[PDB]
């Protein structure tokens, strides 16, 4: 299963996602991106079994856009996390469960501070400055418990992300074919194509 990563600094939050799609024994596309822009100030990154990923992400995107256009006001990332965790909670006991391990992060207008939450496929809401799912967590929590600081900036957080990505590509038999870095801040959504050496 793929690699999804997320790091939040005091100024913004940075989301990392693998570009590999492993189906069968071959690689269908190594330039794919698994991200959804629920709001101009919120990013959605999903993982898990590919059967449910994209349609579920589109479903939450639809509901968020419908609320935003009906009220003309942006939901807080905590509200979106509650929404998606409700979907997981009501879905896992259904006949056809949705097994999607997902990451939610974005900037908050009320408190002027970005937030990042981690939702498993079972629907658990946690608040962490960083997180990962599947086999990519073991090499990220261990490394980010040493150099991560509560007061860092996005630029050196990028260097920390480079160290993490190097650890993944060194100790993963599964090749993620690089990652796509997208930063989330008050300014908006920006894509960073530098992941190997910065």
């Amino acid at each position: 299963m793929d690699i999804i990563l997320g790091i939040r600094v005091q100024d913004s939050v940075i989301l990392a996602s693998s570009k590999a799609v492993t189906r069968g024994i071959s690689v269908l596309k190594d330039s794919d991106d698994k991200t959804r822009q629920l709001s101009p100030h919120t990013l959605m990154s999903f993982a898990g079994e590919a059967g449910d990923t994209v349609q579920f992400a589109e479903y939450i995107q639809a509901n968020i856009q419908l609320y935003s256009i009906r009220e003309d006001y942006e939901l807080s990332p905590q509200a979106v996390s509650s929404f998606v965790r409700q979907e997981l909670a009501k879905s896992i006991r259904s006949r056809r469960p949705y097994q999607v391990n997902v990451l939610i992060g974005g900037y908050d207008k009320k408190k002027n501070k970005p937030e990042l939450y981690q939702i498993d496929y079972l629907g658990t809401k946690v608040e962490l400055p960083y997180g990962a799912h599947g086999y990519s967590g073991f090499y990220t929590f261990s490394l980010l418990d040493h150099h991560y600081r509560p007061d860092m900036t996005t630029e050196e957080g990028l260097d920390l992300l480079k160290l993490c990505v190097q650890e993944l590509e060194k100790r993963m038999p599964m090749d993620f074919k690089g990652v796509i870095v997208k930063i989330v801040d008050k300014d908006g959504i920006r894509q960073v194509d530098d992941f190997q050496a910065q």
Partner: protein, 212 residues
């Protein structure tokens, strides 16, 4: 079974074998693994014969309805997504399917989409599904070029399917080529591998390990 498709400056080229196998024994050699939905977009056979055939024929209904309703051609994205959703609501019922949604538009140009029984929809340029898709993936990427002319693209696809069918047990039979342009797909012809392998071996010299 090995179905492949790629993209270049001229259009969309698909090359699919015509070998259908019933387990160990090859059921048929004259099957058509491309479903002509309409003279704009394409479709391919991979996995369940009936499962793909019916729904890909079922696609033409939605295209006609959308064309009559909006007075305009249905985009490739919607055509892929309706089948993706229909497969999604049927998942877990035993359906196994694989297909290439190949279409050409004005604003978006040539577009290739992948849809399977899993429900995954993908956008890319190089796609190949079947029993011997791996035996093809080792050929096109080496010789891929954005400015390949129509004849070069056709020969590349034909050689790729020849190589895939030579090794894959369930891949073989006649070879069909399709070129997608502004008008739509144009049938190029039927290509039996009997007159293809020998001509390639004599002319190009590939497959040196083969005797004769």
């Amino acid at each position: 079974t090995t179905t492949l498709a790629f993209r270049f400056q001229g259009g969309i080229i698909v090359a699919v074998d015509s070998r259908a196998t019933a387990g160990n024994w090859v059921a048929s050699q004259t099957v058509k693994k491309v479903i002509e939905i309409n003279p704009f977009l394409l479709g391919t056979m991979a996995g369940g014969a009936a499962d793909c055939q019916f729904w890909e024929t079922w696609l033409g209904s939605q295209c006609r309805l959308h064309e009559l309703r909006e007075k305009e051609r249905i985009s490739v994205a919607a055509a892929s997504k309706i089948l993706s959703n229909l497969v999604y609501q049927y998942k877990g019922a035993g359906l196994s399917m694989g297909t290439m949604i190949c279409g050409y538009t004005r604003k978006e140009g040539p577009t290739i989409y992948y849809v399977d029984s899993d429900g995954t929809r993908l956008k890319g340029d190089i796609f190949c599904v079947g029993s011997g898709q791996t035996f093809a993936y080792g050929v096109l990427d080496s010789n891929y070029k954005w400015d390949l002319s129509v004849e070069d693209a056709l020969y590349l696809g034909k050689r790729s399917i020849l190589a895939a069918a030579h090794r894959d047990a369930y891949s073989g039979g006649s070879v069909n080529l399709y070129h997608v342009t502004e008008d739509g797909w144009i049938y190029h012809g039927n290509h039996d591998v009997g007159e293809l392998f020998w001509k390639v071996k004599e002319e190009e010299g590939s497959f040196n390990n083969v005797i004769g």
